[PDB]
Design a protein around this ligand. Structure first.
Ligand code: CDL
Ligand code: UQ
Ligand code: PC1
Ligand code: NDP
Ligand code: ZMP
Ligand code: SF4
Ligand code: SF4
Ligand code: SF4
Ligand code: SF4
Ligand code: SF4
Ligand code: K
Ligand code: ZN
Lengths: 157, 178, 126, 145, 102, 52, 99, 96, 48, 114, 342, 208
């Protein structure tokens, strides 16, 4: 193909490499799934070794790991801290509660899955999913944003 | 019985040596230095970090992972549409519809498990009288859409066909306990 | 000084928080449930039950599940007495249909009638 | 009963019968309670069922290959306490805890038999009778059922 | 009639199969009555007020969590303190919120 | 930075657990207690088991 | 466990504890992942006689609570009592009374 | 065995397939409808009939406690094999 | 599984598949039951 | 037919409490619209408050009126101290929810619900 | 009808509206509101997309599970177009750019792609086609985009004779390029209007009103083969409109009369950008083209939508462009613009 | 002796019966019923007017010393005139005992709060009001504690549906989290898990 197309593809690879090697989650959790999330932070699995480091403010966050039961009282707050994240942001639902309500699906005060509130990039199943499974979801998200072709789509526009 | 965690018994009085020891403790930061030494020892230890995904954390044959539907060695489905798993499912994550098959066998026409609704508790696999539904040890089945976690009978039978070499071995290692 | 008079219907619909549709458009049924004819046990015919009229259940396009739109579809309330269920229904402002309890009729049973000399109750087999 | 079994022997097994496409017979489950025999003798008035044999080999049914088809013949499916006489259209379809019960009236004739419609997930699964002493007692016709 | 039998007994015995069926479909019937059972949980006294109406489902299950009373008493403990002191008090009350909210 | 009043608003993790328990059976209501205090799972199991 | 003796002495001096005796990493002392098959024992009711369920039916020995007094049923010098005898004072630990 | 519709869509072992005018094939557009290839009805049809000697046989599906609950099949009808209601294995009494 | 291979069954997959999410080979759910209510088909011949 | 009062012996001081609560809501509406960045005007908020009061206007039991006043004061406090958010305040307007028509023909065309 | 297309439920998220709609411009400004309304009533929305999956992530929560089918498509790929419209009873065309790229120009975007979509829809036998043109895109207009939309209207009518043609005015909304454009005029010194913003009449229409009109066109039996004119209730001069916009922003207001030829020159200068330009020559020409008065054409009222006024829905757009000083300002603190009957 | 049946001690039953007689004769103005369960638990059912005197007496009496309120809750039995049964479980550390005090209420008769007796009753009565609608007199700040802001209805009541009446979702047209009437993709399948045969003959109610 064109020489400029190759340059654009390599720039896409570089941008995707940077964004997948530096994934900072918001220090945000709701329940037992967030307990497994800090067990992923624990020395056995070392998200920091993978380059994944928690940041407290949503402004410095890249991904949002919805780890727990999203209730009706919590949903505006979750939407607010999602909206306050800057644009290259991703969402990892974790556990059956955040996926589709889970054990509290038919409850009066539970949002039936956080995908009703925020656009979810990756769903991690389990109750709780193990820290292995959450780490697998993080690596799958890294592959997904490695697959992104933003500058190539912009060039083909 | 009970014990005191902070109450001190009697007094140590006052001595020049004890006063000098407390003065050196305050001025020279002795407990801070030994905390530094503890962190230094941890630095020179060996980390407990495995090399995921090339190394996996240990598990047991009892592990409750992705659901699957098993078969007899003849290839006939083990499930007989008895809805015990559906009855005992605490999250109501199982939907079962059934009818007699063309040969008159009692088989399901719909076996759906909402893995976004399931709580991964194993009540289905411990209520199944024929060991049809199991939680095989797969846990790395995260998807990118909510729909792909809504399993039906074809997905569960494909999981049972995929993981039969491991599920059968786990049930062989486990069934004497249960 | 601590006792007033109220000559009203005891309406708490404004306090229950139910939407107006699910009060006015709803019909409830107060009845002793019939004995399930597959069994001979009668312990489920002891208490009064109040249930609601059945609304639409349709098919979910994605999965074929039974989707519903009314919240009072699984609502069954148990009462010790018919007048207690009446009081609860009038208090919550629901129109009701009341079915009187169907007590089984007493029956004259005689084992010796199976071997009657002249009557037709003599059986031909055992 | 007790919570466990002391029976260490082998069980008996009985070949099934083919009394018709309405009533499915799995006669191994039969406990020889003669409810179907008494019903067919006294209410249906057909005298086609009975016990052949003796002792532990006593079997309920018809000695010959006979199709037991009168009206009011699903009530043996009702009154059989075990699942020896089940319903063939209802075979393997649902469970009683699944089925929601709706008390309604039959319109297939002008008797007006009180019935229960068993519906699961918005689909009519079964028709059972209702106890009304002044109309249909405990039974419904085969067309109704 | 309360605990399920072994799987071999269920697959070889009629009574065990019947009891397995009924326990995993309906469950055992608890005789009607009310109790409050308190257990020394790590976070404090974990209580269950169970009311059984005689059926196989509990009529009422109130869960008493120690964190509920501790967080109710958080405001009293924070008098004359700063933000970091409040953080320390929340940490030392051993607070988890699933049992608080239920 | 002095603290004049604390008002803990809770219920942001309220899921109607008691109502779901009263709509489920006892064995079905057991794994709710794992998720009540999700650091003391076996202890809540023991509490519910001793009550039943 | 693969640490050199120099690093082991450095770690032990820096921590003040003998770390090599109690390592936090499991190497070989753990059980094998494959085990011989078990044979679990049976309970006390696994007997073929004198095992009627009515003699061990603890669930049906529950009675309704006994009414000490009622406003409708009863229709109503002794010493004052307590719900229980007062709780005995705990003894101080003979193992380690103070930290 | 797996058969295809006139639309080309695979028919499952339950016989389910979307119609030609059904809009719900758009969920399979640019994706795949996965169908379990091994049909249990054909697989249990492939099993030979076990020739036993007794009038009543016992089946548990094999493996003892790993199989189904142990049932007894009465092989009195000489014009029809006895089928186990759980595992689908067929048995016939050898009268020679 | 070189000194102790698993039991061979004819229905076991001979080729393992990894996670096929966000691929054309991904799993798409559908109702596995057939149609329950059958509509009346009007006749193709006019009455007059 | 003789019951224990909550706060009001009869309907007059119950209506007095209702008027006090309406006064408090009427004063608090402009502050809410200024503080929470609401798209609505002050006229719309007071219209909504009047609509809620007129929705509850049909009751004649003093105890029910007292409990309605207590609930209204709880919601008023939740609006004064900013605990209700913009979403919680705008939930009174149902602007995303289409209304079901009240005529028989439209209810017949839509579905089986009466 | 098919048994799976019969409507069911009460019209909520989990209901069935019986609408299988392939929405082509769903990734843009109007498309997100159209998809939101369709998924809100509960519909099978097929989204053929060209941009990134990240760029279509915001649409993923607008419907229930399995009710939104995203699939890649190419505007040069008739096979992709026909596989998008193969299972649909409504095809909605919202394809459009406000500028020209080196790959797609105004002629392709507004004629060739709509003709291809309508041709594929007619071959696939969909029941209803809805095409969004522009108001006052009649023919022989001063701007190339409006002439292109006129030719596209003619081609869509020739291929699909019963196509519902919807011509809205300048749509305003949260993510629009009309109110946000005039608010982003504050980043320069003055507001360069042609003839000081007079003799230019506009009646902007709310994006939710347009989307409700489009959905009611999917459902309406009497809308087939008609051309609708979607306009707001009030017509404003361009000067008074920009004055009201800056008044709602509370920023400042310094108008400046700039002649149209040099205004088109600086619009071209802004338009020669590799990314999305701030403005183009076609953009300033469409700004200074007056809106015609819809007399014979039906509109939002005839499709069952009450036109919400700009005075009512203005603060949800322009509050972002304020500073901290004027951030908490109500509706009533801004004087509404003077309307004109002509 | 029997390995499957709970051992029973009669001394606790005797002590609780004696203390129930003690409290009943001390407070005949309010005590309506005194019972001791077979699980050795003492329950005293009182008039709602005597909640403050009964709780104060149990906390401050020398022979009671029930200084710790274990919990406060309500049970909705919607077949009696006063549907809400208010239950106070109390702990005496001095005598190592537990007691239960019951009273009744309906939707329109509030009962006195015992915040002046126990401070935990503040949040406990807030929960009771939020979940059942039982108002409490003289509460320092009574409001909702677990439901969402603006939640209508008291969800722990029997007649309140399990799924509620409204559900939340993010609407992109209004850019907010909005409440809609509840629609479920799959309805909660209720089960009739009641055997038609009587299980406990000791609790057989007489026929009506
Ligand atoms: C100064 C000290 C430098 C480090 C050193 O000498 O460490 C050895 C050794 C480390 O002791 P240890 O902590 O017991 O070693 C860990 C295991 O016991 C033994 O570890 P292991 O058995 O798992 O594998 C060890 C192996 C691992 O081998 C590798 O990692 C090879 C990497 C090759 C990459 C191409 O070899 C080494 O680590 C040899 C030393 C390499 C030092 C490299 C320094 C430069 C780094 C790059 C700078 C640019 O040092 C000492 O015992 C004394 C240290 C002070 C010496 C003065
Ligand atoms: C039981 O109850 C509960 C709780 O209670 C206990 C909960 O809590 C709870 C909530 C639970 C959670 C939210 C889970 C959260 C998990 C934890 C709290 C545990 C995890 C632990 C930590 C967060 C502690 C981490 C500690 C560390 C030491 C890690 C280090 C972290 C840091 C932030 C510091 C390091 C910094 C970074 C990672 C970023 C640094 C790098 C940069 C910013 C780069 C800057 C560099 C440049 C710009 C240089 C550029 C210039 C050049 C010249 C370069 C040249 C370039 C070229 C291209 C050539 C729940 C739900 C709960 O139920
Ligand atoms: C500087 C020290 C850095 C850390 C060194 C290794 C830490 C571990 C040492 C062993 C240990 O745990 O000892 C605990 C012990 C303390 O144990 P202790 O807490 O039981 O106290 C002993 C008992 N009394 C109270 C009577 C003293 O540390 C010491 O004995 C020495 C601590 C004080 C001296 C060091 C700190 C002050 C140094 C000031 C001058 C700067 C020095 C040169 C710096 C050059 C580089 C910038
Ligand atoms: N916006 C307005 O003020 C008005 C608009 N209209 C018309 O309404 C329609 C929708 O408006 P609006 O939302 O503002 O438009 P947008 O600028 O937001 O773009 C609409 C959609 O067109 C798609 N698109 C554009 N060019 C191509 C192409 N070459 N191939 C594939 N897809 C393409 C875009 O997809 P992607 O993002 O992937 O490139 C986008 O999703 C347009 O036809 C417009 O002319 C009418 C009146 C006023
Ligand atoms: C921003 C928006 C936020 C909106 C918030 C709304 C708050 C809702 C508060 C509701 C408070 C109440 O419901 S108290 C009103 C009920 N009380 C009564 O009806 C008392 C009896 N009613 C009457 O007497 C009625 O006739 C009238 C109309 C109230 C008085 O008429 P008089 O004239 O004979
Ligand atoms: S999915 Fe399970 S483990 Fe995760 S938050 Fe929900 S209850 Fe806890
Ligand atoms: S593991 Fe538990 S929650 Fe999941 S399907 Fe089985 S019974 Fe249901
Ligand atoms: S419990 Fe087992 S046999 Fe019964 S329906 Fe479930 S999977 Fe099938
Ligand atoms: S009714 Fe059933 S159990 Fe009784 S004799 Fe007839 S077949 Fe046997
Ligand atoms: S359910 Fe009843 S009839 Fe059927 S096999 Fe079991 S005990 Fe026999
Ligand atoms: K039967
Ligand atoms: Zn078998």
């Amino acid at each position: 193909r064109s020489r400029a197309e190759y340059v654009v593809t390599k720039l896409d690879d570089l941008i995707n490499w940077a964004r997948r090697s530096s994934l900072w989650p918001m220090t945000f959790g709701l329940a037992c799934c967030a307990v497994e999330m800090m067990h992923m932070a624990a020395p056995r699995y070392d998200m920091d070794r993978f380059g994944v480091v928690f940041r407290a403010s949503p402004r410095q966050a890249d991904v949002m790991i919805v780890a727990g039961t999203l209730t009706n009282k919590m949903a505006p707050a979750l939407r607010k801290v999602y909206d306050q994240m800057p644009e290259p942001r991703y969402v990892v639902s974790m556990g059956s509660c955040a996926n589709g309500g889970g054990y509290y699906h038919y409850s009066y005060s539970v949002v039936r899955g956080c995908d009703r509130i925020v656009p979810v990039d990756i769903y991690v199943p389990g109750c709780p999913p193990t820290a292995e499974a959450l780490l697998y979801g993080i690596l799958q998200l890294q592959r997904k944003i490695k697959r992104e072709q933003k500058l190539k789509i912009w060039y083909r526009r | 019985t009970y014990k005191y965690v902070n109450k001190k018994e009697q007094e140590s009085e006052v001595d020049m040596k004890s006063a000098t020891d407390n003065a050196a403790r305050i001025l020279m930061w002795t407990e801070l230095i030994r905390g530094l030494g503890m962190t230094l020892s941890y630095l020179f230890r060996e980390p407990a970090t495995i090399n995921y995904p090339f190394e996996k954390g240990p598990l047991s044959p009892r592990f409750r992972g992705e659901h699957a539907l098993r078969r007899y060695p003849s290839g006939e489905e083990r499930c007989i549409a008895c809805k015990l798993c559906e009855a005992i499912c605490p999250a109501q994550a199982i939907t079962i519809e059934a009818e007699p098959r063309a040969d008159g066998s009692r088989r399901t026409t719909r076996y759906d498990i909402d893995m976004t609704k399931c709580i991964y508790c194993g009540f289905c696999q411990e209520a199944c009288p024929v060991d049809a539904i199991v939680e095989g040890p797969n846990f790395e089945f995260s998807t990118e859409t909510h729909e792909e976690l809504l399993y039906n009978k074809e997905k569960l039978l494909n999981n049972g066909d995929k993981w039969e070499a491991e599920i059968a071995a786990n049930i062989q290692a486990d069934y004497l306990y249960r | 000084t601590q006792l007033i008079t109220v000559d009203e219907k005891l309406d708490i619909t404004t306090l229950t928080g139910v939407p107006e549709e699910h009060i006015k458009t709803r019909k409830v049924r107060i009845f002793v449930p019939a004995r399930n004819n597959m069994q001979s046990g009668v312990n489920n015919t002891k208490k009064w039950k109040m249930e609601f009229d059945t609304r639409e259940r349709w098919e979910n396009p994605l999965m074929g599940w039974a989707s519903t739109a009314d919240p009072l579809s699984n609502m069954v309330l148990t009462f010790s007495a018919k007048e207690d269920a009446i009081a609860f229904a009038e208090k919550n402002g629901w129109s009701y249909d009341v079915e009187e309890k169907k007590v089984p009729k007493p029956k004259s049973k005689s084992y010796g009638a199976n071997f009657s000399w002249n009557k037709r109750t003599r059986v031909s087999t055992k | 009963g007790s919570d466990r079994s002391r029976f260490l022997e082998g069980k008996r097994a009985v070949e099934d019968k083919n009394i018709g496409p309405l009533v499915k017979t799995i006669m191994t489950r039969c406990i020889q309670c003669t409810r179907c025999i008494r019903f067919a003798s006294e209410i249906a008035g057909v005298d086609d069922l009975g016990t052949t044999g003796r002792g532990n080999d006593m079997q309920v049914g018809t000695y010959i290959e006979k199709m037991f088809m009168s009206e009011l013949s699903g009530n043996v499916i009702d009154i059989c306490p075990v699942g020896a006489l089940t319903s063939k259209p209802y075979a393997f379809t649902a469970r009683p805890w699944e089925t929601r019960k709706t008390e309604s009236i039959d319109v297939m004739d002008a008797v007006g038999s009180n019935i229960v419609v068993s519906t699961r997930t918005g689909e009519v699964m079964r028709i059972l009778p209702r106890m009304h002493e002044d109309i249909n007692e405990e039974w419904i016709s085969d067309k109704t059922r | 009639k309360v605990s399920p039998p072994k799987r071999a007994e269920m697959k070889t015995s009629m009574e065990s199969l019947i009891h397995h069926f009924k326990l995993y479909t309906e469950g055992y019937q608890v005789p009607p009555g009310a109790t409050y059972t308190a257990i020394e949980a790590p976070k404090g006294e974990f209580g269950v007020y169970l009311v059984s109406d005689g059926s196989s489902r509990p009529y009422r299950c109130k869960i008493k969590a120690p964190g509920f009373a501790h967080l109710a008493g958080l405001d009293k403990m924070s008098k004359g303190h700063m933000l970091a002191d409040v953080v320390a008090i929340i940490g030392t009350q051993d607070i988890v919120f699933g049992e608080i909210d239920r | 930075e002095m603290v004049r009043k604390c008002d803990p608003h809770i219920g942001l993790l309220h899921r109607g657990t008691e109502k779901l328990i009263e709509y489920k059976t006892y064995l079905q209501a057991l794994p709710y207690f794992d998720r009540l205090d999700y650091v003391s799972m076996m202890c809540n199991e023991q509490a519910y088991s001793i009550a039943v | 466990a693969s640490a050199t003796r120099v690093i082991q002495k450095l770690r032990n001096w820096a921590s003040g504890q003998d770390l090599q005796a109690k390592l936090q990493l499991r190497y070989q002392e753990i059980a094998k992942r494959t085990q011989p098959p078990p044979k679990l024992p049976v309970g006390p009711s696994h007997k073929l006689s004198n095992n009627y369920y009515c003699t061990r039916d603890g669930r049906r020995e529950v009675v309704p609570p006994s009414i000490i007094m009622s406003s409708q049923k009863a229709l109503v010098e002794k010493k004052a009592v307590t719900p229980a005898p007062p709780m005995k004072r705990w003894e101080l630990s003979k193992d380690q009374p103070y930290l | 065995g797996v058969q295809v519709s006139p639309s080309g869509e695979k028919i499952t072992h339950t016989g389910q397939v979307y119609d030609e005018k059904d809009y719900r094939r758009v969920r399979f557009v640019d994706r795949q409808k996965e169908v379990n290839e091994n049909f249990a009805i054909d697989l249990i049809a492939q099993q030979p009939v076990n020739e036993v000697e007794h009038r009543i046989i016992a089946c548990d599906g094999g493996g003892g406690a790993l199989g189904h609950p142990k049932v007894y099949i009465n092989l009195d009808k000489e014009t029809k094999t006895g089928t186990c209601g759980y595992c689908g294995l067929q048995f016939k009494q050898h009268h020679h | 599984p070189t000194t102790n291979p698993p039991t061979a069954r004819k229905f076991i997959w001979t080729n393992h598949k990894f996670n096929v999410s966000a691929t054309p080979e991904q799993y798409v759910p559908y109702s596995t039951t057939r149609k329950k209510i059958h509509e009346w088909v009007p006749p193709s011949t006019p009455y007059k | 037919t003789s019951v224990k009062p909550i706060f009001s012996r009869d309907l007059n001081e119950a209506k007095r409490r209702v008027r006090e609560l309406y006064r408090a809501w009427y004063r608090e509406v402009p502050n809410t619209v200024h503080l929470m960045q609401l798209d609505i005007t002050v006229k719309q908020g007071r219209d909504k408050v009047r609509e809620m009061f007129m929705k509850n206007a049909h009751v004649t039991d003093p105890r029910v009126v007292d409990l309605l006043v207590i609930k209204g004061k709880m919601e008023l406090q939740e609006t004064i101290k900013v605990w209700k958010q913009r979403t919680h305040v705008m939930r009174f307007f149902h602007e995303t929810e289409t209304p079901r028509p009240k005529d028989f023909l439209s209810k017949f065309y839509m579905g089986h619900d009466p | 009808l098919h048994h799976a297309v019969i409507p069911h439920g009460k019209g909520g998220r989990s209901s069935v509206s019986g609408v299988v709609a392939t929405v082509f411009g769903a990734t843009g400004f109007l498309g997100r509101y159209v998809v939101n309304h369709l998924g809100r009533m509960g519909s099978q929305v097929i989204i053929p997309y060209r941009c990134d999956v990240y760029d279509i992530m915001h649409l993923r929560l607008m419907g229930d599970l399995g009710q939104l089918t995203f699939l890649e498509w190419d505007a040069r790929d008739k096979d992709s177009i026909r596989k998008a419209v193969q299972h649909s009873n409504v095809v909605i065309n919202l394809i459009g750019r406000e500028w020209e790229t080196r790959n797609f120009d105004f002629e392709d975007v507004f004629v060739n792609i709509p003709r291809a979509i309508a041709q594929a829809s007619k071959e696939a036998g969909v029941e209803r086609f809805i095409h969004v043109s522009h108001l006052n895109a009649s023919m022989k207009s001063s701007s190339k985009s409006l002439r292109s939309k006129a030719v596209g209207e003619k081609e869509v009518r020739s291929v699909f004779p019963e196509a519902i043609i919807i011509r809205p005015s300048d749509i305003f909304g949260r993510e629009d390029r009309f109110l946000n454009h005039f608010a982003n005029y504050r980043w320069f010194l003055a507001v360069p209007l042609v003839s000081l913003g007079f003799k230019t009449v506009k009646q902007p229409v709310y994006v939710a009103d347009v989307s409700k009109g489009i959905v009611n066109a999917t459902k309406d039996p009497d809308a087939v083969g008609k051309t609708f004119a979607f306009t707001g209730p009030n017509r404003y001069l361009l000067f008074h409109l920009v004055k009201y916009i800056f008044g709602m922003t509370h920023r400042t207001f310094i108008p400046y009369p700039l002649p149209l030829f040099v205004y088109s020159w600086i619009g071209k200068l802004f338009g020669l950008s590799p990314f999305e330009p701030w403005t183009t020559k076609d953009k300033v020409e469409r700004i200074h083209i007056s809106d015609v008065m819809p007399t014979d054409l039906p509109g939002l009222e005839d499709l069952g939508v009450q036109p919400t006024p700009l005075e009512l829905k203005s603060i949800e757009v322009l509050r972002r462009h304020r500073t901290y000083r004027w951030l908490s300002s109500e509706i009533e603190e801004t004087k509404p613009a003077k309307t004109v009957n002509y | 002796k029997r390995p499957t049946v709970r051992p029973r001690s009669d001394v606790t039953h005797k002590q609780l019966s004696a203390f129930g007689e003690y409290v009943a004769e001390i407070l005949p103005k309010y005590v309506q019923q005194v019972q001791v369960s077979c699980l050795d638990e003492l329950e005293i059912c009182i008039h709602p007017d005597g909640v403050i005197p009964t709780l104060t007496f149990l906390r401050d009496h020398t022979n009671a010393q029930f200084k710790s309120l274990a919990d406060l809750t309500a049970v909705d039995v919607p077949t009696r005139q006063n549907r809400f049964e208010i239950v106070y479980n109390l702990l005496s550390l001095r005598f190592n005992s537990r007691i239960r005090v019951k009273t009744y209420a309906d939707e329109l008769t509030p009962i006195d709060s015992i915040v002046s007796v126990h401070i935990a009753a503040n949040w406990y009565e807030r929960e009771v009001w939020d979940m059942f609608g039982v108002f409490f007199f003289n509460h320092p700040d009574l409001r909702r504690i677990l439901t969402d802001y603006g939640f209508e209805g008291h969800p722990f009541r029997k007649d309140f549906p399990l799924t509620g009446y409204v559900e939340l979702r993010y609407d992109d047209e209004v850019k907010r989290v909005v409440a809609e009437p509840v629609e479920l993709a799959q309805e909660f399948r209720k089960f009739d898990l009641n055997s038609p045969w009587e299980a406990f003959p000791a609790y057989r109610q007489p026929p009506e």
